[PDB]
Symmetry: D3
Subunit: 92 residues, 6 copies
């Protein structure tokens, strides 16, 4: 019901702008797949390293799950900024 | 000359870790291409809008070049965090 | 022309969600006004301090224009995250 | 007991600077109220959606609690940067 | 086995670059020690304040563990950016 | 004139809290010195590479000045978060 026109900052977008935005989102989905793969790798690494207290300590000290989460958040906020550069909402 | 072994935090990487890291970097290159395309679009948009003072003001108020730069920086730091989740340097 | 339905991640929003989003944007406009006021203050401070080389050096060393810009960027990305928490796009 | 003078970077502030800082903090309190309201909305949304496995999955996939937390953190660090632009501590 | 040469973006580093990078990492270790000390202080503060419901509420409202974690993450990503300024990988 | 008591969020600090805060600031000054040294190195690198168009292009493509600035900003906001974990202002 044209909900977007009810939200402050709405701007009419061309097809080229919509296509660029969807390009961002589809490259983002490839990053989501990569991040899932890394997370699976981390889980297998943690598993295979069970009862290797030195290697469990190494993994805990490198904090890879935390770094993967930081990376996911940066990728997602970067996508939002790029999409904002295309959409150009009039609002602050 | 094994320069990396001279840097604190070095860890020996498997081929699978190296391949995951290179995957991150190659998806990142696709984002670099996308960002270049958006930047070209912004330049053409600024050009075609010359002597449309209302539209030059609109563009200045949306600050799209700034948002594209914020997005590039987030994409790049996200790539670094994901690569760190794979590499797992022992150092803080 | 229902442009939003053409963008991946679209979700139908209730009036309450739209109102919460607009609330975010209107509080954000109050922050934009505050930031403008601080920027005006910084310009007057720089002016009144002209030919006070110790105070021009103090201002340059505190880098207040840079800190105001960092704050504006954090306020704006925070608004985007809050709006995303309301809108809940299905996409990564 | 003038504790602040014991902290490196102290600068004497005018009443106008103190008032601008307090303005930042009071606008921030309005954002805190907004964030509380959004969080309450998210909790009610999760409740009303109980035993709607498709909608519980949708909510889990949008990660709204995480996005609200990211937004709160950006709002708070933005406030700190703006206040730093006013206070202008001499320290790095 | 020259693993780094297998990673896209490799550049040959001089001894001065390696030394600057290690300097960053060693200053970072001093920050890690400081952060550990602050965390110990927070734990003792929480302990000594047990059954002081007003002070437990004060601590919960200031969220110091969260702020310490935000600071650790900023210190670590800052170290990565500085090291990147020295290393200068050719890759995006 | 007890200016800090006029700012919302004031809390009375112990000597141990003030000392921890000053420790943060003094480690930060060591990072400021390191960043200055890296910046000097970058300037000498740019100089010695004058009229080596391939190496000027390499430097421009690595964007080391930008990465050093990102690192400085992360170090400084990390210091602010750590200090906030010690100071514990009552305010949002
Ligand atoms: N053990 C762990 N596993 C996974 N993620 C973690 C973690 N510890 C912290 N995090 C995550 O790291 C990010 C910010 O520092 C946050 O994610 P966001 O999403 O951003 C934490 O949840
Ligand atoms: N007019 C403009 N054009 C392009 N980039 C801009 C700009 N104004 C600011 N920036 C950029 O926005 C980012 C942080 O706010 C910085 O990029 P980084 O790289 O991150 C600014 O250079
Ligand atoms: N002298 C100056 N005046 C105003 N803004 C400045 C500045 N030097 C740097 N910046 C700004 O600080 C932010 C990131 O560090 C960037 O803004 P964004 O927008 O984010 C720089 O443009
Ligand atoms: N399920 C969840 N609910 C609430 N907050 C969450 C969450 N998962 C992660 N977070 C939060 O998201 C921010 C960084 O990614 C962190 O908050 P800060 O505060 O910043 C996480 O705690
Ligand atoms: N109660 C708590 N204790 C410790 N850390 C916390 C916390 N609540 C949130 N966090 C942490 O704050 C950062 C982002 O907001 C995240 O750390 P990272 O690492 O970054 C959260 O885990
Ligand atoms: N050529 C250049 N030289 C130095 N700093 C640069 C630059 N281009 C961008 N920046 C800086 O990178 C940060 C955000 O991306 C900003 O600094 P802040 O401070 O943060 C830009 O000014």
């Amino acid at each position: 019901d044209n909900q977007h026109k009810k939200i402050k900052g709405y701007r009419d977008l061309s097809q080229e702008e919509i296509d660029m935005m969807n390009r961002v989102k589809e490259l983002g989905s490839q990053f989501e797949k990569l991040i899932q793969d890394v997370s699976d790798h981390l889980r297998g690494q943690y598993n295979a390293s069970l009862h290797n207290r030195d290697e469990i300590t190494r993994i805990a000290n490198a904090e890879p799950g935390r770094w993967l989460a930081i990376g996911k958040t940066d990728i997602q906020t970067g996508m939002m900024a790029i999409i904002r550069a295309i959409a150009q909402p009039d609002s602050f």
